[PDB]
Amino acid sequence: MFENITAAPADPILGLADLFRADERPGKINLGIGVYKDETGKTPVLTSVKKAEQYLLENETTKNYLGIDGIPEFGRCTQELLFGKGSALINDKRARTAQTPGGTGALRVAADFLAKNTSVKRVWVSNPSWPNHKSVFNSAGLEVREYAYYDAENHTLDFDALINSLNEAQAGDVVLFHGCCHNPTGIDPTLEQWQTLAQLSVEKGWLPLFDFAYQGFARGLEEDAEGLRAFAAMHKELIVASSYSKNFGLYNERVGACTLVAADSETVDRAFSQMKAAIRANYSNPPAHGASVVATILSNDALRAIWEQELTDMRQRIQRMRQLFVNTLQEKGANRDFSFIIKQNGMFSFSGLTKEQVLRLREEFGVYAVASGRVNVAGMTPDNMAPLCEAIVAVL
Amino acid sequence: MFENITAAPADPILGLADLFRADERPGKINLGIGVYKDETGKTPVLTSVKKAEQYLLENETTKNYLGIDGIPEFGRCTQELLFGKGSALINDKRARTAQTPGGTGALRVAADFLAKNTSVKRVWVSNPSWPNHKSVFNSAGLEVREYAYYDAENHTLDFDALINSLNEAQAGDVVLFHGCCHNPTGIDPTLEQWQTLAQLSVEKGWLPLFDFAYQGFARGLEEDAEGLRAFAAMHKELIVASSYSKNFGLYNERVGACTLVAADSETVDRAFSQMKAAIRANYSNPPAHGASVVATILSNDALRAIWEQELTDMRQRIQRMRQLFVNTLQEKGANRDFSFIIKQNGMFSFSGLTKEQVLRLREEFGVYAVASGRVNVAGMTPDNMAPLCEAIVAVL
Ligand SMILES: *Cc1c(COP(=O)(O)O)cnc(C)c1O
Ligand SMILES: *Cc1c(COP(=O)(O)O)cnc(C)c1O
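^ Those are the sequences you sent over. The predicted structure of the assembly is below.
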């Protein structure tokens, strides 16, 4: 019987999508998007992945089931990407990877594993964080507490407020860290802050969980991983949920991984069998296409070279738009100090607009941003930059 | 901390897989498989789906996210397949479909929806049923009770034992029905038994849940759906979890659907928004490739004609192997009455071997079957039929 079923709440970002595509004005700019767009305003499929897909089409002979944890080459390629090509974690075989449906699937199977096999009751998420983090852990019945993160005034990482909230977390509490390109703020810990965090975590008995969705968008693939690697040098156990949605432009093929690391090569196998049991009772075994694309790009040097170039071009495009935004706002002129945008990493940052200012942006100018003032920098193109900055200067 | 984590139990069928592929004898036959195989012993990718994939490769311009419920054409094609091309359910818009990662994903999001939004506490599953049914519902915290189904003696549907167990189910309990090709037995209700079941269900207040994984393997696409359609004529609400894994040979692309039907066009939307919320907290939005393949085959008549022929050829191959098995056992000769195999539908049936007899099959003859005596008829080829029947006659 379903007549007393309460409609689910209006989706905190998709509402803007539907609202946007009902405006009769092409001067309208949607900076609320969440996905990368190139200078043309389009989300292309990469050249390297169309090459990989022609290859798969020429060479696949069966669509028979992958094992629960997916394609093995995909697994070894992702823990080399994560941990570095000769890491002790990999040589001692203390990491196991399950291929999952995107980074969100990786977080739900991590959550289900934890809820069914360990005694964790709370996951600490930054304030702010990606909003679907609360939903994911709560559906497995983990409670979500949040730690201080953002300084709204200097638009930076309030590190002392952050370590001071974390002293409320007990041993065996899970603390979620964004690997790089913190969503929504774009502020990430410096390597020195990652190390003190790696060290305080070990002392206090935090189980670290990295949400690593943007490898390659802050600085480069290896550099973006130095934070996770600092925890991994120091921790016997950790979980990283990574996603290939954004750095391979493979969003809708759902390709991600859930890597479990344990003290040794044998407790990780014992724990991984239950992670596998958690996957079997959810979607059974993972979608092969997008993970086969990633595995064949990364293991083929000609293809990986091309991918790498397509990714530093996406990274550079975003860094150019953060730069063009800050001084185009300084040509259109307002009491501002939007330069903090040049310090933030990846596609998102809080613009510092009030909810009323984003409201007259949507309403009076057709500039759509998320009510928190979060803007997706990749929705800026050299051509739409000047109408955007005008609209913004006119509401400040 | 993971050192007290108990290893998950040895997988009830995959153990045979690993055991099989460690035999030095190519006379070895694995009838434990679960996937379809053709006369060559191979699980090919269909011609229609390689054609659909060349088309997608030529024509996709983005991998941007599908909406939570997936591609809309895939949704309308599956509820026409399920309900018939002009069904009142479709014209009154009382059905909504979410594209899911396989039929197992469709069952976990049905389970999560139910556990979070309704007051169901128990799901009735046949005894026997597909073993991952218990796991799926239990991970959402629904308890699984089982109803009588199989008569081990006459190898048939013990219908009176079945309606007599079901009288233990209260109103608002969920009762799971296999749409056709009951796994593991291959015995399905006749249309007359579906109708009395449709009628008793409505009286008693059962929420019916169809697990519909084998459309097209018993009789034809339309005929295989007449059981579900009889419930759907009579019910205001029902859920069907369907899978395209087997009838499209798309196993590892994870393509399935979860269809929710409610009294009207507006309570189904209200309920569907929460089903959507249950998807967002699990894998976010579904894998596009395999569902794009199904949607383009089914909406293109030249491609659908080809698919249809490839599916009646898979159906016919299985019906020929059930027939060749029964009289090859009657040429090799033993006190048998294996003719019940000719009455069962789809790829599986219980052979009626004891667990000790399947054990000396694996051990002494290299014939691998599941310990319950379940055999996958599609693992029989005209060439391996005679060694198989010999091994079997020699253990009876
Ligand atoms: C995009 C994102 C994810 C995962 O996305 P998928 O589409 O599920 O791969 C996880 N965490 C954060 C912070 C993200 O921004
Ligand atoms: C195969 C099967 C499913 C679903 O399989 P997926 O691979 O997840 O599509 C569901 N129920 C039964 C009875 C099955 O045999």
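Chain B touches chain A through 73 residues (CB under 8 Å). The pocket of pyridoxal-5'-phosphate (ligand 1) is lined by residues A 102-104, 130, 178, 183, 211, 213, 243, 245, 251, 256; B 284 (CB under 6 Å).

Shout if you want it in another format.
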